[PDB]
Protein backbone atom coordinates (compact mmCIF):
# COMPACT_ATOMS: atom_id res chain seq x y z
CA UNK A 1 0.00 0.00 0.00
CA UNK A 2 2.93 2.31 0.72
CA UNK A 3 4.84 0.37 -1.92
CA UNK A 4 1.85 0.89 -4.20
CA UNK A 5 1.81 4.62 -3.45
CA UNK A 6 5.52 4.78 -4.32
CA UNK A 7 4.96 3.08 -7.68
CA UNK A 8 2.12 5.46 -8.54
CA UNK A 9 4.17 8.53 -7.57
CA UNK A 10 7.00 7.31 -9.80
CA UNK A 11 4.58 6.62 -12.65
CA UNK A 12 3.14 10.11 -12.20
CA UNK A 13 6.63 11.63 -12.44
CA UNK A 14 7.27 10.34 -15.96
CA UNK A 15 3.65 11.04 -16.95
CA UNK A 16 4.07 14.70 -16.02
CA UNK A 17 7.21 14.73 -18.17
CA UNK A 18 5.33 13.14 -21.06
CA UNK A 19 2.48 15.63 -20.65
CA UNK A 20 4.97 18.52 -20.84
CA UNK A 21 6.01 17.32 -24.29
CA UNK A 22 2.43 16.76 -25.46
CA UNK A 23 1.71 20.34 -24.38
CA UNK A 24 4.72 21.61 -26.33
CA UNK A 25 3.76 19.66 -29.45
CA UNK A 26 0.12 20.74 -29.23
CA UNK A 27 1.09 24.39 -28.72
CA UNK A 28 3.61 24.42 -31.57
CA UNK A 29 0.89 23.11 -33.87
CA UNK A 30 -1.58 25.72 -32.64
CA UNK A 31 -3.89 22.95 -31.43
CA UNK A 32 -5.36 24.83 -28.46
CA UNK A 33 -8.12 22.33 -27.66
CA UNK A 34 -5.54 19.56 -27.40
CA UNK A 35 -3.11 21.75 -25.44
CA UNK A 36 -5.72 22.73 -22.84
CA UNK A 37 -6.78 19.12 -22.33
CA UNK A 38 -3.19 18.06 -21.67
CA UNK A 39 -2.73 21.06 -19.38
CA UNK A 40 -5.69 19.98 -17.23
CA UNK A 41 -4.35 16.41 -17.14
CA UNK A 42 -1.03 17.88 -16.00
CA UNK A 43 -2.69 19.62 -13.05
CA UNK A 44 -4.49 16.39 -12.14
CA UNK A 45 -1.31 14.28 -12.15
CA UNK A 46 0.53 17.00 -10.25
CA UNK A 47 -2.04 17.29 -7.46
CA UNK A 48 -2.39 13.51 -7.30
CA UNK A 49 1.38 13.29 -6.94
CA UNK A 50 1.71 15.78 -4.07
CA UNK A 51 -1.18 14.20 -2.17
CA UNK A 52 0.52 10.80 -2.23
CA UNK A 53 3.81 12.47 -1.26
CA UNK A 54 1.93 13.95 1.70
CA UNK A 55 1.14 10.41 2.83
CA UNK A 56 -2.54 10.66 1.90
CA UNK A 57 -4.15 7.26 1.28
CA UNK A 58 -4.91 6.46 -2.36
CA UNK A 59 -8.73 6.39 -2.15
CA UNK A 60 -8.75 9.78 -0.42
CA UNK A 61 -6.15 11.22 -2.82
CA UNK A 62 -8.47 10.51 -5.75
CA UNK A 63 -11.37 12.32 -4.07
CA UNK A 64 -9.29 15.31 -2.96
CA UNK A 65 -7.70 15.62 -6.41
CA UNK A 66 -11.18 15.62 -7.96
CA UNK A 67 -12.16 18.52 -5.69
CA UNK A 68 -8.94 20.35 -6.60
CA UNK A 69 -9.76 20.00 -10.29
CA UNK A 70 -13.30 21.29 -9.81
CA UNK A 71 -12.10 24.32 -7.85
CA UNK A 72 -9.64 25.12 -10.65
CA UNK A 73 -12.63 25.40 -12.98
CA UNK A 74 -12.66 21.99 -14.67
CA UNK A 75 -15.67 20.23 -13.11
CA UNK A 76 -16.31 17.91 -16.08
CA UNK A 77 -12.78 16.50 -16.12
CA UNK A 78 -13.08 16.36 -12.32
CA UNK A 79 -16.15 14.09 -12.30
CA UNK A 80 -14.71 11.79 -14.96
CA UNK A 81 -11.50 11.75 -12.93
CA UNK A 82 -13.49 10.93 -9.78
CA UNK A 83 -15.68 8.18 -11.25
CA UNK A 84 -12.76 6.52 -13.04
CA UNK A 85 -10.56 6.89 -9.97
CA UNK A 86 -13.08 5.06 -7.78
CA UNK A 87 -13.22 2.33 -10.42
CA UNK A 88 -9.42 2.16 -10.60
CA UNK A 89 -9.09 1.90 -6.81
CA UNK A 90 -11.33 -1.18 -6.92
CA UNK A 91 -9.24 -2.76 -9.67
CA UNK A 92 -6.02 -1.71 -7.94
CA UNK A 93 -6.70 -3.31 -4.57
CA UNK A 94 -8.01 -6.53 -6.13
CA UNK A 95 -4.78 -6.72 -8.13
CA UNK A 96 -6.19 -6.27 -11.64
CA UNK A 97 -3.92 -3.29 -12.40
CA UNK A 98 -0.42 -2.10 -11.53
CA UNK A 99 0.59 1.22 -10.01
CA UNK A 100 1.68 2.39 -13.46
CA UNK A 101 -1.61 1.33 -15.07
CA UNK A 102 -3.49 3.05 -12.25
CA UNK A 103 -1.56 6.28 -12.79
CA UNK A 104 -1.95 6.32 -16.57
CA UNK A 105 -5.64 5.44 -16.74
CA UNK A 106 -6.43 7.85 -13.90
CA UNK A 107 -4.88 10.81 -15.69
CA UNK A 108 -5.57 10.00 -19.35
CA UNK A 109 -9.08 8.49 -19.31
CA UNK A 110 -10.70 11.78 -18.24
CA UNK A 111 -8.39 13.62 -20.66
CA UNK A 112 -10.29 12.12 -23.59
CA UNK A 113 -12.51 14.25 -25.82
Taking residue 12's Cβ as centre, other Cβ atoms within 10 Å add up to 27
C-alpha distance from residue 90 to each of 28, 50, 58, 97, 98 (Å): 39, 22, 11, 9, 12
Boundaries of domain holding 43: 2-108
| Number of domains comprising the chain | 1
Entry resolution (Å): 2.1
DSSP string for 29-84: TT-HHHHHHHHHHHHHHHHHHHHHHTT--HHHHHHHHHHHHHHTT-HHHHHHHHHH
Instruction: Quote the CA–CA distance of 99 and 113 in Å, as a whole number.
Output: 24
Instruction: Quote the CA–CA distance of 57 and 62 in Å, as a whole number.
Output: 9
User: With contact defined as beta carbons under 8 Å apart, do 109 and 40 qualify?
Assistant: no
Instruction: Quote the CA–CA distance of 30 and 48 in Å, as a whole number.
Output: 28
In a domain, 113, yes or no: no
In a domain, 86, yes or no: yes
Amino acid sequence: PEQMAEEIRQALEKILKQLENEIEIARNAGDDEREDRYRIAYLAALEAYRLLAEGVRIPEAVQRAAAYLASMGYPHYAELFRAKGEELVKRLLEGKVTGEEFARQLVFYPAQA
